[PDB]
Structures are given as C-alpha cells and as structure tokens.
Design a protein around this ligand. Structure first.
Ligand SMILES: Nc1ncnc2c1ncn2[C@@H]1O[C@H](COP(=O)(O)OP(=O)(O)NP(=O)(O)O)[C@@H](O)[C@H]1O
Ligand SMILES: Nc1ncnc2c1ncn2[C@@H]1O[C@H](COP(=O)(O)OP(=O)(O)NP(=O)(O)O)[C@@H](O)[C@H]1O
Ligand SMILES: [Mg+2]
Ligand SMILES: [Mg+2]
Lengths: 345, 345
C-alpha cells in the first residue's frame, strides 16, 4: 500500500532525471562516465561498471587504469575508451596531469572497481578525489577499494564545495568498517546506522547493499519525495533481486548509479531544458539528485539481477547481466517514461 | 517531392559504382582498404572503421597502427590484417618504406581513426599523406585527428595529381577549426560554409556531419547529379538517423565511405567492364566519384544508426552497428541494385 505508492513515486522522480533521446542532443550530452580502477590482476570489475554504464545509456565510458589490466579490458569491448595512465613507472605529477586531462571530460567518476589496496593505486584514487573535489560539476560514485580509501582517510569526502554529488556503495562488511572508522555504535537501530554514517561523512549519499538496500544522505527525505510526523531519513529498496550471488553485481550498480547521477546533475544544470526537460522547480529535488540516482540504480540493479537469474538460474554470471541491462532499462525506465509523456527515454 | 526525387537519383548514381558479385572477380577486386591510426590507448575507432569496411563489402581491410593498439585490435577479429609498423622504436626511413609497402597494396587509405595528436603519429600520417599524393590511383578518407593534421598543415591535401580522390569527414567542431585555419568567415550562409572550405582545400569533398550532413567539393553539382538556375554546390543528407549519440558512428561512416570510394574509382578505371559494369559515359560522374561515395556513405550510415537504434534503443553501442552493416547494406544498396538489374550487389 503506502510502501508501493512511495516506491513508485520515488522511482517516478528518478525517471524525471532522464534526458529524452532527442534529435537536438549531440554526442556526450547523455553522459561521459569514467571508471577509475583496474590494477594488477583485477580486470572484470572495471569492465562491468563501465560497460554497464554504456548499456544503461552513457554516450562515452572511460576506464582509467594500469597498463596490464588496461590491455585486457580493451579486448572486452571496442566501445570503451581505456586510459592506461596509472602507470607506476610514471611520475606523480605526470599522473596528476594525465588524470586531470581525462577527468575534465567527465560528468561522473566511479572510483574503486578493481582498484585494489596497494599504495600506488590508493594514491591515484586520492589524487582523483582531490581533483573531483575542486571540479564543482563532477559527480563521484565510490565502490570496492575506493571505500577502503575513505575508511582510511574519510576527509577525502568531507567539505566539498558545490551541490552534494557523492554516492558510496558499501556492502555489509565495507559498511561495518566505515561505521567503525566514524565511531558509529553498532547497537543502534538497524535503519538508523546508514543515516548516521552519511551524516558523519558530511551527508554523502550511501547505498548500504544487502538483502534489501538502505539508502540515506543523513537528512530527512523532503516532502517532494517521501503528517505531524517527520519524513523518514532513509529509504529501503526491497524489490525482488536475483538469487545467484555471483561476484560483480555491485559493479553493474555503480555503473548505472553513475549514469543516473550524471543525467540528474545535467538536468538540474539546465542542459535538457531546450529538449523539453527543464530543471525541477523544487529545491529539494535539486539537493537530492544523489539520493534519487541511488534509489533508481538500486531498484534497477536488483531488477537486472532478477531478470538475469530468471534466464540463467544457477549458471548466471555477471557478464550475462551486461547484455541484459538494455532490456531491463526499457522495462524500468524507458517504456514507463515514454508512456508518462516524458519523450523517448 | 523534388527533394525525394533528387535524393533517390543521387543514391541511384552511388549504387551504380558497386561492382557485381560475379564469378569472374578474384580476391581484392572488390576493395583493399587501409585504416591508419591506432595509437597508444585508442583501440576501438580503427576497429570500427576497418571492420565496418569489411562488413560493407571490402575483400581485405588493413590496419596500420602502433604495436600496443595493434595487439588489442587483432584480438577483435581474425579477419583484419593489422600491421604494427608505426613503432616509434623504428627509424623514420623504415616506417616510410614499411608504409609504402602496405600502401602499394591498397585502393583507399582512411587516415585518422584512433590516430591521436602526438608528434610521432602525426608524422606517420604526414608520411602517408605524402605517399598517397604520389600514388595517383590511391583514394584517401580523412577523419578524427587526421583532420587535426590538415588543420595544422592544409597543404597536405592541396595540389594533388590525378583525379580528385580525397574525402574529409569533420564533425561540428573539427569543421569550425578547419574553417578558422582557411580564414572562412562564420557569418556566411550556413550551407555555403562547406563549399567554401572545400574550395579553399582544392575542391576536396567534405562531409560536414551533424543533425543533417552537408556534402560539397566546392563545385556546382553537375547536370548528371542535381532550369535557368545553377545547380546547387552542396548536397544535404537529411535521412533519419539514430537517436543514441554513442561514440564511434563516424568510424562506421569512414569505413563505408572508403569502400564506396574504392569501388567507384575502380569502376571509372574500367576494372568492372568485363563483368558488365563499364565506366560511365559522363565525365561529370568520373569527376564526382568522391561526392557520390560521400553521399552514399552518409545516407547509409544514418540508416545503419537508425536500424541499430530501433533494435537497441538507449543501450546501443557502435559495436552493435558493425554487426548490422550487412543487413542495412542489403536494404540500401544490395536488394535495390539487384532489382534495378545491376546484378548481385
Ligand atoms: N540476499 C539478496 N537478495 C537479493 N539481492 C541481493 C541480496 N544481497 C544483495 N543483493 C543485491 O546484489 C547486489 C550486490 O550486493 P552485495 O553482494 O551485497 O554487494 P557486493 O559484495 O559489493 N557485490 P560485488 O559487486 O560482487 O562486490 C546489489 O544490487 C544488492 O542489492
Ligand atoms: N542529431 C543527429 N541525429 C541523427 N544523426 C546524427 C545527428 N548528429 C550526427 N548524426 C550522424 O551521426 C554520425 C556521426 O556524426 P557526429 O556525431 O556529428 O560525428 P563525430 O563527432 O565525428 N562522431 P564520432 O565517430 O563518435 O567521433 C553521422 O552519420 C551523422 O550524420
Ligand atoms: Mg563489492
Ligand atoms: Mg569523430
């Protein structure tokens, strides 16, 4: 009842972020997404995140990685632009300037897929956090060992200028580690842990992944989204996912999260006004693009896993899901948005 | 009305360039196409152009690139011949002679896909421009950073011997940069900019890519193609394309442009006379092979993007389009040409 209406309503708000597929748009206005990771042996995760982003709808996806992983990742798909610029044989200044060059061409950077924990790649991720901080129109999604960096240096996400534009996606153990760093007591009510952590991290948006996902930026969900009672300060996605717990499904999530974050950010900026999607009136929607991107992506990713599991069952691997992103996008966003009168979504 | 009749007529002339698939032809007479590019990290664009060329109908497609990109590009397809001869550890003379060896086996060289802007690859492209200039039966298609070289040294396309045989394919910004180099005033009428630039570049044929494509070699479109009024000096392709602005669709265009340029050039040379396609009577058609190849490829590429977008929608990537070149070729050229009595096209 209430839960179904609220879920549909918030999903509808997420759908409102999506630019129409319109003759007047040119290459790049539907999203330029970067994935920073791919160290050493970790080839699959940055592919899943970046190719997931392309199948979800990005015009361009960039992978920023080390040379060895980069050579593998390029063979998976000619549609990815793979920058092997995190070469430990390069000076730090050269890496910083190479990273700045690529990042200046991005709406959103996903930090973490296949990043690993060694000093070099962690330092490269820290550089990227620092550049993103000072690029006010840059969104950031943090996953995998990107979250290890936050756990070690939480200030990398704290006190950013501009609108809020960070989404963290910890699994159960990554979340517990984050809470321990921020001295958040685990005896708290289960649904209060995520808003506490988000608050302690300067109201970044956090997707706490699990049997259900708990989403929060630490603030109450404004009237535009969620009587005499205050609106909840978290959202819980319980939509049916898949039953096969094969590795990589969080990378589909980060890639699709990054795309929705880029679209919603460009939407609020006014980029889609000339194709009939002007920014929203309500300041609360502008301030909550990360929560809407997060809620939409969480919902979508479980639906992708559900459909992949219906097709493949016990045999499902995450590579299968990359091929199903398009049809599930059409189910969740494209066909509903078009029937809603939003244009070809 | 008039626009539909003219479009169909010019497309019919482009179709007349296509050799029949005939038992008497042997390997290579339906096109030996080269793509010069593939530097550093840029793996996808030369694949899209060269594999697009093969799916369009070339007998052999060659990629001329650096070793690192070449190793990736080879894994995409055993049908491409990848020459990793642009090795910066090789002497210039060795590169020149290696390039000359491969180019002497080509009808057409596509310069630019994944070329990049660094001194080495730009110098390799300049060598290739110089050899092509002095190989009178060699056609050239210039895209991507091949156009950066022209923008820096426009003489590389000026004063070529033989028939005109160069086609440039700038997008909106590349076109503006070219106009600035050639001191062409942007206040001019919109459809007069492309013929002015082509004229300033010695009547090379230019595809100005955009919401529609404007095609011109700077000269009026002769009576064979376009009362008391002079024929237009440009053609405009407005056929429906796709709505997904994913990167790489200009590489499908360059590969298909290169194939049509090779076929039309061999056709005028007399190569297909013994299989029932003698050269055209009209000198204007011979002088306008580049415009016909350009018009046919522009039309075809938007139709490919249209069909790929109908199948994949928001999820379309350019890799999907490579697989659809064959069926769209059959729609645009093969089945119409056969019903026209041109043989199995
Ligand atoms: N029990 C569950 N039932 C259904 N969906 C689930 C379940 N647990 C997690 N998910 C979903 O599966 C995806 C990945 O979640 P989860 O396995 O918790 O993260 P992870 O450990 O980071 N995965 P990975 O990408 O392999 O590193 C998310 O979309 C979750 O919502
Ligand atoms: N708004 C549009 N609607 C439909 N087709 C378009 C539109 N803009 C460009 N095209 C076509 O898309 C293809 C690529 O054009 P365009 O994006 O302008 O070039 P580009 O920037 O060089 N692309 P790329 O190959 O990624 O570098 C051409 O076949 C164009 O005719
Ligand atoms: Mg994970
Ligand atoms: Mg281009």
């Amino acid at each position: 009842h209430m839960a179904s209406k609220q879920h549909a309503h918030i999903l509808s708000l997420a759908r409102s972020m999506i630019p129409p597929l319109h003759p007047k748009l040119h290459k790049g206005q539907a999203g330029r997404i970067g994935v920073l990771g791919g160290s050493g042996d970790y080839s699959g995760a940055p592919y899943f995140s970046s190719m997931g982003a392309m199948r979800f709808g990005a015009d361009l996806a960039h992978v920023i990685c080390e040379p060895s992983a980069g050579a593998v990742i390029k063979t998976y798909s000619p549609d990815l632009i793979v920058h092997t610029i995190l070469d430990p044989q390069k000076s730090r200044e050269d890496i910083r300037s190479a990273l700045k060059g690529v990042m200046s061409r991005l709406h959103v950077l996903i930090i973490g897929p296949g990043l690993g924990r060694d000093d070099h790649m962690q330092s490269c991720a820290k550089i990227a956090f620092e550049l993103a901080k000072d690029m006010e129109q840059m969104g950031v999604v943090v996953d995998a060992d990107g979250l290890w960096l936050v756990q070690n240096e939480p200030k990398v996400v704290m006190d950013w200028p501009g609108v809020p534009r960070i989404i963290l996606t910890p699994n159960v153990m990554e979340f517990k580690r984050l809470c321990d760093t921020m001295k958040i007591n685990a005896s708290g009510p289960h649904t209060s842990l995520c808003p506490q952590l988000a608050t302690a991290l300067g109201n970044a948006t956090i997707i706490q992944k699990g049997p259900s996902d708990i989403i929060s930026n630490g603030l109450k969900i404004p009237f535009a989204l969620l009587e005499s009672e205050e609106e909840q300060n978290y959202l819980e996605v319980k939509v049916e996912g898949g039953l096969k717990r094969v590795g990589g499904q969080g990378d589909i999530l980060s890639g699709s999260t990054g795309v929705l974050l880029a679209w919603g950010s460009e939407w609020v900026r006014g980029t889609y006004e000339h194709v009939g999607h002007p920014p929203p009136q309500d300041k609360a929607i502008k301030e909550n693009i990360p929560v809407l991107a997060a809620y939409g992506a969480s919902t979508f990713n479980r639906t992708v896993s559900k459909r992949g599991f219906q097709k493949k069952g016990r045999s499902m691997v995450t590579g299968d899901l990359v091929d199903m992103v398009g049809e599930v996008y059409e189910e969740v966003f494209g066909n509903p948005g078009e029937v809603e009168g939003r244009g070809k979504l």
